[PDB]
């Protein structure tokens with residue numbers, strides 16, 4: 001009973017590895033000639049009917065903290081934003097001392113400027129916030145831009161919008177993407193409801209801090225996942241069943257005035273503000289947040305932390321991390337957010353009004369990528385944006401406390417964690433169809 | 446002043462590069478063909494009889 | 499090679515070949531101006547006297 | 550080369566630096582370099598020996 | 603129609619019937635920072651397929667799926683019988699017990715083909 | 727002199743004897759900056775389009791020949807015109823239009839009943 | 852890697868066994884574009900000759916015979932004078948200027964050879 005060997009073409013073997021992924025869109029961008037930042041126009045359209053296939057009698061290990069596909073997601077957003085800000089107007093000769101006067105949240109800063117014609121002096125004025133200008137004096141009203149030292153400040157391109165439309169990632173042909181939608185997934189463990197997909201669903205490439213917006217809701221109930229709960233410096237990612245919504249706006253009605261720098265370059269800024277001045281705020285409805293927080297602490301009392309938990313605000317210090325970042329309509333918000341964590345969970349306002357300031361000159365991508373600063377141009381009129389809170393980023397505080405459990409702070413202060421809350425159930429493999437097996441065949445010839 | 450100091454960055458046509466339009470031929474790759482209608486008095490949009498590949 | 503007994507519906511006002519033709523002439527002329535001399539400090543006052 | 554000093558940053562313009570020594574500490578000297586005798590001319594003798602062909 | 607990657611964790615015998623459903627959807631899928639990622643990953647599938655298309659095209663196969671080889675199955679590696687491997691393990695399970703030997707297996711399957719090409723050549 | 731795209735609009739049976747005059751140019755990939763990147767993304771189309779049909783050909787019956795037959799019994803759900811109409815007064819372009827919705831359904835039944843032959847070829851030995 | 856470009860100076864008849872160790876290794880920012888253009892070049896070197904092999908006789912094998920006459924205008928060395936006291940480097944240097952007319956000769960009586968199967972069926 002001698003046995004020979006035979007080959008087999010079409011053998012499913014995974015042995016996961018790392019590759020380069022595609023970009024796909026839903027082709028719902030009917031508004032032509034928009035051409036947003038992430039080049040959604042420059043992605044392959046027409047991918048309907050995502051025919052998923054079910055897998056059975058199969059066990060394999062999923063991982064999320066050791067995933068390297070999310071590194072590609074974080075690498076793209078650094079490159080996607082950097083390449084968009086290159087081919088439009090720079091405003092680098094604006095590093096001039098400003099003789100401002102209070103008009104207050106906003107300022108009436110004025111300066112001497114040189115037009116496109118050289119050796120010409122024009123008295124032009126703009127409006128800046130406190131978060132964009134810093135003084136170098138004792139009491140003199142001189143002001144200068146925040147990032148003029150060892151950095152280059154460029155203007156965001158005006159005709160390209162910041163709308164967060166979803167995109168779909170896809171592996172190349174021969175590479176499969178697996179997914180797990182088993183109920184109450186641990187985060188790092190074997191799965192049973194494994195289903196191969198042609199390619200993954202729509203990721204939302206929105207950037208946020210201290211919260212998560214426009215994510216995917218949970219399947220059954222509020223799940224909390226992490227690597228180890230015993231460590232102090234590790235982040236915590238949560239997911240909600242009932243989405244918390246915000247109906248908020250920014251009443252700051254004004255007009256945009258084009259100030260020439262330059263040889264073809266144009267500096268955009270707000271001019272004659274119209275109407276009663278007001279600050280940026282957002283309402284969060286009570287009986288939908290503390291009720292939501294009640295659901296979160298139901299299994300936060302499970303076998304990770306025992307009892308006597310308490311919610312606290314951010315640590316403080318560096319302002320660019322501790323507040324909650326926000327973005328809608330082309331404006332970047334940095335918001336007071338201590339009122340959502342001023343409570344203690346142990347065993348009369350209708351809505352929560354969060355004050356919030358506006359930072360036109362951001363520095364978020366420079367400290368991780370070094371591409372440069374960004375001057376967000378002002379947006380005409382009053383803008384209003386509504387979003388759903390679908391996740392929170394919590395981090396415990398290291399210390400000693402014999403009587404009670406250590407406090408919880410929301411200042412995660414990381415970028416990669418914002419994309420692991422939606423790519424938590426995806427894994428890329430390579431399919432080599434080869435394989436050998438013995439049988440009874442002699443190759444007669 | 447120069448006429449284009451508005452909304453343009455004025456560069457110079459590069460001296461060692463000529464503007465002479467030498468004829469070029471557009472050619473489809475393998476697996477693709479180009480259909481030519483060399484019929485007399487082509488209307489512009491409609492049927493053509495003397496189609497040449 | 500000529501073709502006999504053949505019919506086909508042609509068009510020239512919605513052809514995608516001429517749309518690609520316009521894309522090149524923008525790109526070839528724009529790339530030809532980059533890697534040599536620019537003249538941007540010239541937009542200054544010009545004291546002009548007619549000859 | 551004895552040149553131990555603290556480099557200085559010069560504010561050329563918007564977001565740029567120009568590192569140059571301006572604070573040299575110690576005693577000035579000319580940078581010298583050793584090449585060992587009785588070994589270099591040993592090499593130079595070997596260079597010409599195979600050139601005697 | 604079990605679809606792409608269908609009976610993959612299923613029986614060996616059932617997986618011996620649907621080899622070709624993993625072959626037609628292998629290289630044909632849907633079709634400038636996204637453009638370079640589009641191009642450098644499309645060509646990554648073409649050369650990876652041709653990387654193990656020679657391997658079919660050298661040993662015994664020309665373009666077929668299940669071609670026999672005259673290697674006599676030396677007993678150094680796993681020696682499970684016919685009623686064991688074809689009954690209650692999947693293809694992913696089988697690949698874990700043979701993965702390190704494939705360096706020696708592949709250079710031996712391509713062997714005894716030049717030894718065969720002479721036999722047909724000298725007979726003519 | 728037939729040439730590339732010869733009897734295309736002619737009789738279907740007339741073109742059934744002249745397959746090789748135009749199948750050679752689909753083959754023969756031998757050789758005998760804006761447009762630098764246009765060449766790169768279009769030369770890969772030469773190897774994508776050629777090899778994109780040599781996978782499906784080599785699976786079913788055709789190893790190195792153009793006309794390989796299979797054992798599919800030609801189900802009557804799609805068009806069932808007789809022999810004297812298909813091969814005499816109809817063209818290949820007209821034929822694919824009538825059968826375009828069923829090309830994938832006819833194809834997906836060909837790789838099956840081919841493994842049923844390959845497994846029966848192995849089991850016979 | 853063990854025998855890549857191996858016994859190239861040995862007997863011409865010792866190339867019976869060393870074909871596989873060589874045939875197995877024909878495919879193994881503007882800087883990425885230059886690196887990518889070399890990757891697609893190797894995709895053209897291989898399969899530019901496999902298309903040739905896929906034409907005449909060698910669809911999926913290494914040694915395929917052909918019924919061309921092999922006339923005596925070129926060198927008339929016999930089987931013993933070729934396969935024993937010669938290397939392939941020296942052999943290809945003698946028919947280098949004749950292989951251009953050779954390659955089209957196998958194509959002759961090959962498309963004609965493809966006609967009889969159509970004629971029979």
Ligand SMILES: *[C@@H]1O[C@H](CO)[C@@H](O[C@@H]2O[C@H](CO)[C@@H](O[C@@H]3O[C@H](CO)[C@@H](O)[C@H](O[C@H]4O[C@H](CO)[C@@H](O)[C@H](O)[C@@H]4O)[C@@H]3O)[C@H](O)[C@H]2NC(C)=O)[C@H](O)[C@H]1NC(C)=O
Nearest residue numbers: 031163164206213214326327328329330384385386387388
């Ligand atoms: C989370 O997702 C929500 C989606 O509900 C998102 O809220 C939307 O933000 C956009 C950002 O500008 C708001 O503005 C819209 O942008 C689209 C872009 O195509 C426009 O088409 C919209 O115009 C409509 O309304 C006009 C009248 O005002 C019509 O004339 C026009 O034809 C359009 O119908 C509009 O300008 C948009 O309003 C909100 N949507 C809601 C329901 O609030 C939110 O921004 C996302 N979260 C974050 C953090 O970005």
Ligand SMILES: *[C@@H]1O[C@H](CO)[C@@H](O[C@@H]2O[C@H](CO)[C@@H](O)[C@H](O)[C@H]2NC(C)=O)[C@H](O)[C@H]1NC(C)=O
Nearest residue numbers: 101103107108109110123125126127271272273
């Ligand atoms: C800001 O300061 C200026 C002083 O330069 C205030 O006055 C404006 O001055 C400019 C320059 O001549 C005029 O074009 C405007 O018409 C002036 N404004 C008015 C209302 O007369 C200016 O009012 C201050 N405030 C703002 C919001 O610009």
Ligand SMILES: *[C@@H]1O[C@H](CO)[C@@H](O[C@@H]2O[C@H](CO)[C@@H](O)[C@H](O)[C@H]2NC(C)=O)[C@H](O)[C@H]1NC(C)=O
Nearest residue numbers: 052053054055179180181182183192193194195
């Ligand atoms: C494992 O999870 C999969 C989802 O990936 C389940 O498939 C779905 O099951 C639900 C039942 O609640 C159906 O409504 C869906 O239609 C199923 N999906 C599809 C695509 O048909 C699968 O049933 C789960 N396995 C078990 C044993 O429950």
Ligand SMILES: *[C@@H]1O[C@H](CO)[C@@H](O[C@@H]2O[C@H](CO)[C@@H](O)[C@H](O)[C@H]2NC(C)=O)[C@H](O)[C@H]1NC(C)=O
Nearest residue numbers: 316317318319322323335336337338339342355
């Ligand atoms: C964001 O808002 C909160 C709430 O107003 C700020 O907390 C207050 O800080 C001021 C500082 O002068 C204190 O006087 C108040 O007592 C604080 N509020 C409460 C309820 O204690 C928080 O400081 C703000 N963020 C920043 C960076 O200043």
Ligand SMILES: *[C@@H]1O[C@H](CO)[C@@H](O[C@@H]2O[C@H](CO)[C@@H](O)[C@H](O)[C@H]2NC(C)=O)[C@H](O)[C@H]1NC(C)=O
Nearest residue numbers: 213214215217242243244245246386387388389
């Ligand atoms: C945010 O939450 C709201 C309400 O919970 C969602 O609005 C519903 O969306 C579903 C499906 O998208 C619709 O079938 C309902 O009709 C919507 N409700 C209403 C009142 O119209 C909304 O989709 C969520 N997501 C976003 C991005 O807004």
Ligand SMILES: *[C@@H]1O[C@H](CO)[C@@H](O[C@@H]2O[C@H](CO)[C@@H](O)[C@H](O)[C@H]2NC(C)=O)[C@H](O)[C@H]1NC(C)=O
Nearest residue numbers: 481482483484485494495496497498499500501
């Ligand atoms: C269809 O077009 C072809 C060429 O595209 C025509 O062939 C040419 O006909 C003219 C007669 O006016 C001859 O002088 C040329 O020598 C022909 N070309 C070649 C290559 O031989 C053909 O006549 C046209 N047919 C019709 C019916 O218009």
Ligand SMILES: *[C@@H]1O[C@H](CO)[C@@H](O[C@@H]2O[C@H](CO)[C@@H](O)[C@H](O)[C@H]2NC(C)=O)[C@H](O)[C@H]1NC(C)=O
Nearest residue numbers: 553554555556557569570571572573574575577
């Ligand atoms: C170089 O020349 C300067 C004079 O321009 C010398 O004096 C220095 O001047 C600067 C600017 O006023 C002061 O900050 C320094 O403290 C001066 N130096 C001393 C030693 O007082 C300077 O000494 C010369 N040499 C060097 C090495 O800088």
Ligand SMILES: *[C@@H]1O[C@H](CO)[C@@H](O)[C@H](O)[C@H]1NC(C)=O
Nearest residue numbers: 098099110111112113121123
């Ligand atoms: C620059 O602006 C200040 C503001 O008061 C003014 O005093 C000064 O004269 C200006 N400089 C010139 C050269 O006009």
Ligand SMILES: *[C@@H]1O[C@H](CO)[C@@H](O)[C@H](O)[C@H]1NC(C)=O
Nearest residue numbers: 102135137138139140141142
């Ligand atoms: C600056 O001077 C004004 C005018 O007297 C005074 O009101 C203010 O307190 C001073 N600010 C500081 C920081 O000394």
Ligand SMILES: *[C@@H]1O[C@H](CO)[C@@H](O)[C@H](O)[C@H]1NC(C)=O
Nearest residue numbers: 134135136146147148149150
């Ligand atoms: C220059 O800007 C940086 C911002 O990173 C700031 O830390 C530094 O203090 C500024 N320099 C001076 C002299 O204020």
Ligand SMILES: *[C@@H]1O[C@H](CO)[C@@H](O)[C@H](O)[C@H]1NC(C)=O
Nearest residue numbers: 185186187188189226227228
């Ligand atoms: C989740 O996984 C971690 C490590 O991956 C493990 O310590 C923990 O017990 C798991 N929780 C479960 C299986 O509920």
Ligand SMILES: *[C@@H]1O[C@H](CO)[C@@H](O)[C@H](O)[C@H]1NC(C)=O
Nearest residue numbers: 065227228229230231232234
């Ligand atoms: C989590 O932290 C504990 C101690 O702080 C450590 O023993 C454990 O290994 C950590 N978890 C992981 C996955 O490394």
Ligand SMILES: *[C@@H]1O[C@H](CO)[C@@H](O)[C@H](O)[C@H]1NC(C)=O
Nearest residue numbers: 245246247248283284285386
């Ligand atoms: C937000 O606005 C929408 C639009 O009118 C409304 O349907 C919804 O009830 C509002 N929600 C809250 C909490 O105000």
Ligand SMILES: *[C@@H]1O[C@H](CO)[C@@H](O)[C@H](O)[C@H]1NC(C)=O
Nearest residue numbers: 253254255273274275381382
């Ligand atoms: C906002 O300002 C513009 C122009 O100043 C005006 O047309 C518009 O009516 C204002 N909006 C409201 C709500 O009054």
Ligand SMILES: *[C@@H]1O[C@H](CO)[C@@H](O)[C@H](O)[C@H]1NC(C)=O
Nearest residue numbers: 286287288290291294349350
């Ligand atoms: C939650 O908020 C609602 C708001 O109306 C309030 O009635 C309720 O008592 C709160 N519950 C707790 C536990 O704070």
Ligand SMILES: *[C@@H]1O[C@H](CO)[C@@H](O)[C@H](O)[C@H]1NC(C)=O
Nearest residue numbers: 310311312313342343344407
């Ligand atoms: C939150 O943490 C700060 C840090 O010192 C502490 O002072 C404060 O009391 C904490 N809040 C609560 C409610 O315990």
